[PDB]
């Protein structure tokens, strides 16, 4: 089939994520086939190569055309594809996975890990197992869970309600009344005059305010990012974990971090957890964990909550809790191996000594830069959120599509970074294994792009 | 291999959260573990080293049979090319896009127009919900969100698909089902409180009093199995499928055929849709779209509900519906290669074929036997349900075990048929593969399991 009969073969019959529907199947809004990528680039169906600043959606961590992958995947495939792991049914590689997660990457404490496709499947797990944890203890009223504005958990019904971003809610009917939200904890956004440590007491007292008026009792646990990914790739206060974590510990709230995208080395560290002293009752990984070469997702389950489900099993038989597809192992092939490149290469080690690389040469490209509001990030994270007025704050006319212009320019230009949903942003979560040249012909492009627009709008 | 069999069995129980596992017998070793190594055609072989007849294809799944080098393959061509970029915003690879076509053209029922891709049954169940519910805001009909489902349904084990599904174990504990969901009857004659054309009209009556109640205005769709799988391998009754689809289109109820067991060749027609003359507006798809070799899903979306979408784009932008891995590269190059397989073999005729010999050879052999109430199954699915007293209709008292007892002799006897959930049921769905001769292979293994169990508790 030519490039032109596979486009209408798109336009026709493939339903995408995230793509305007009409735009899309007109023609207005064009396909783009991908078609190779290797090390941090990637090739498209005109033979455009592109720097991925973006790693696919902050996940190919090890870099493109790894076939150490490819390989371990392929003989997992020729010698056992799948089988299920009902009724303890396993293979090797899931076993070894599950030891290796809890030993090597999850913070202390963690005992079990569930294994499902993706970061949205994981969290619903998670919902499902903290409202087991307070039925079998005798809590039944304790079941809300509190999630924070521009939070990004998944995109299903109770995942979509979890995230605080409107486009995941419009038209379906989200949030669920069971999912409230406190405040987006990013101190760029708070009043003239307040400190960093006056903000962090702000965010802790409206948490407490939502406790209240909810009723502790009525709060199963609450969800968090440690770094905000696709809201905005916010960094939290610093303090922001240590007060929000004593919170929840009083009012006996149960803590899910969302690692989706810090986990597997991305922030220098391996989870965010251990980035910033968060100890989680149970967590949520996906992305990184395969880097993913295939598709997987880890529910972590820590001491506490498994020791409910394990009595809850005595006085009530197996849990109803499973996917045909859980435990996969061509998929747990793929991260096994994807966890022997991370930690042979030592990626968290040149995650924390790029990232740093990155955030002072964005600071020094763009931090004066008239376009520029804030520039921010952490490890191998980082943002440029575009302001019409810097001392105010003040935001461009969302119409002007500043963040889009940006994103469209450096594409041209040669590089693949995000608009960021809701605002203009500008997003980098490159692989892990980008070095400090790559990172100054980011910056470069990005300059270039960021000045390009500046011209038109300012 | 660094790791023993033995030590591989301990880490399994201290570190690895099995989907559908008594937790505590399984942590104990009570519920010993069990490793599948490696298998062929219909036959896997365990870490001991025995071998046995997968009468059960995994879960329904692996349709092809096991140790596809061809499969394997693509698998690894496509991981070795480009294993990940995501399809947001337009972006795809040929694979995907071929497999969208080719589902639409030959696989899929007359009027259906796109696909969307996710990881599981279950994520797949959870778009269709989604769906109908943007359907029914953007058409400006808010209170049209209502699902009906059916009692011993499977659709799935999250919050909102676990509400679909009509199995008590997939909601205890879960506060399933949510308020929007609904159950109506199951279509299992033999179990019912009549005529076979009674029962039909019961059925009929029953879904009419619930849309009736609820108020037509209020219900926006209505999901069902082709042939329940999960619930006990129950075909429909004679006329179901007629006069169901006219009491829904009456009511402007949107139709959602779950294929997730039936699709790709199972009955020996292309789907259970194609068997039975079911016209849906919405299909979901899993399982045998790849034989399991890869995690695949999708919803195939027709030509009313993707106009409305479309439509829905222009006035209100872009939907907000995406998952990291929906269109996964390696599972589109999997189900592809899995296509070509089926039709290369033509393995909706060997299904065809093979399948109404296991019927007729199971009704042989279990249609006098004492134990056995309903020999029942249409294609390449088929079961025993054992019951207490034949003329009576009277089942067993559960605690006795008589499912399990069968399922667990036949597996000590050298084949996998499962214990269905909530009943005594023996279920085979084996691989689509499957030869005449193993077909009197597997029965004959079933006899001398129906027989030693009749024997202990007769
Ligand atoms: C923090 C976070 N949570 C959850 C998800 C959902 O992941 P998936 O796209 O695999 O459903 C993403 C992406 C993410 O970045
Ligand atoms: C009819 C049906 N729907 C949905 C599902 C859910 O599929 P998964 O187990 O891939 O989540 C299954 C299994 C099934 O048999």
Redesign the interface.
């Known amino acids: 089939?030519s490039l032109d009969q596979?486009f209408e073969?798109?336009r026709?019959?493939?339903?995408?994520?995230?793509?305007?529907?009409?735009?899309?199947?007109s023609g207005a809004?064009?396909?783009?086939?991908?078609?190779?990528?290797k090390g941090i680039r990637?090739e498209d169906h005109e033979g455009r190569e592109y720097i991925d600043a973006f790693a696919?959606?902050y996940?190919?961590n090890i870099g493109?055309?790894?076939?150490e992958?490819?390989?371990a995947?392929?003989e997992q495939?020729?010698?056992?594809?799948?089988?299920?792991?009902?009724?303890?049914?396993?293979?090797?590689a899931?076993?070894?996975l599950?030891?290796r997660?809890?030993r090597d990457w999850a913070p202390a404490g963690m005992?079990?890990?569930?294994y499902?496709?993706?970061?949205?499947?994981a969290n619903?797990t998670q919902?499902?197992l903290v409202?087991?944890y307070n039925?079998?203890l005798g809590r039944p009223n304790k079941?809300k869970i509190i999630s924070r504005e521009r939070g990004y958990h998944?995109?299903?019904?109770?995942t979509?309600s979890l995230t605080g971003?409107?486009?995941?809610?419009?038209?379906?009917?989200l949030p669920i009344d069971r999912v409230k939200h406190t405040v987006c904890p990013h101190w760029y956004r708070a009043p003239a005059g307040m400190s960093e440590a006056q903000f962090v007491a702000y965010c802790v007292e409206e948490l407490e305010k939502l406790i209240a008026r909810e009723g502790a009792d009525t709060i199963a646990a609450f969800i968090a990012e440690p770094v905000m990914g696709t809201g905005g790739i916010i960094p939290p206060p610093q303090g922001y974990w240590e007060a929000i974590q004593a919170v929840l510990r009083k009012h006996d709230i149960l803590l899910i971090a969302d690692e989706v995208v810090c986990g597997f080395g991305r922030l220098g560290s391996k989870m965010g957890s251990q980035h910033y002293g968060i100890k989680p009752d149970l967590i949520t990984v996906?992305?990184g964990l395969t880097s993913?070469?295939?598709?997987l997702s880890g529910?972590i389950?820590g001491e506490k909550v498994?020791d409910v489900?394990?009595?809850?099993?005595?006085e009530?038989?197996?849990?109803?809790?499973?996917?045909?597809?859980?435990?996969?192992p061509?998929?747990a092939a793929a991260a096994l191996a994807n966890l022997d490149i991370l930690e042979r290469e030592n990626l968290t080690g040149n995650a924390a000594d790029v990232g740093a690389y990155l955030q002072q040469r964005l600071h020094e490209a763009f931090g004066a830069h008239p376009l520029v509001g804030e520039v921010r990030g952490v490890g191998m994270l980082a943002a440029l959120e575009f302001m019409a007025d810097k001392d105010a704050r003040t935001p461009f006319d969302p119409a002007l599509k500043v963040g889009p212009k940006v994103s469209a320019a450096a594409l041209e230009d040669g590089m693949i970074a995000r608009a960021m949903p809701h605002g203009d942003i500008l997003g980098f979560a490159p692989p892990l294994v980008t070095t400090r040249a790559e990172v100054d012909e980011i910056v470069g492009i990005a300059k270039q792009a960021v000045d390009e627009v500046a011209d038109e709008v300012l």
């Open positions: 089939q596979l073969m798109d026709a019959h493939f339903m995408h994520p995230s793509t305007h529907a009409h735009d899309h199947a809004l064009p396909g783009r086939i991908i078609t190779g990528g990637i696919g959606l996940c190919v493109y055309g790894r076939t992958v490819a390989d995947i392929y495939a020729k010698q056992l594809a799948y089988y299920h792991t009902y009724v303890g049914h396993s293979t090797d899931i076993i070894e599950s030891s997660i809890i005992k079990k890990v569930y499902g496709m993706s970061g949205s499947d619903e919902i499902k409202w087991y039925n079998v079941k998944g995109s299903g019904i109770v979509g971003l409107p486009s995941f809610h419009q038209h379906f009917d996906a992305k993913a070469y295939a598709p529910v389950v498994w489900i394990e009595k809850g099993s005595q009530h038989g197996p849990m109803g809790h499973g996917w045909t597809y859980s435990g996969h061509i998929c």
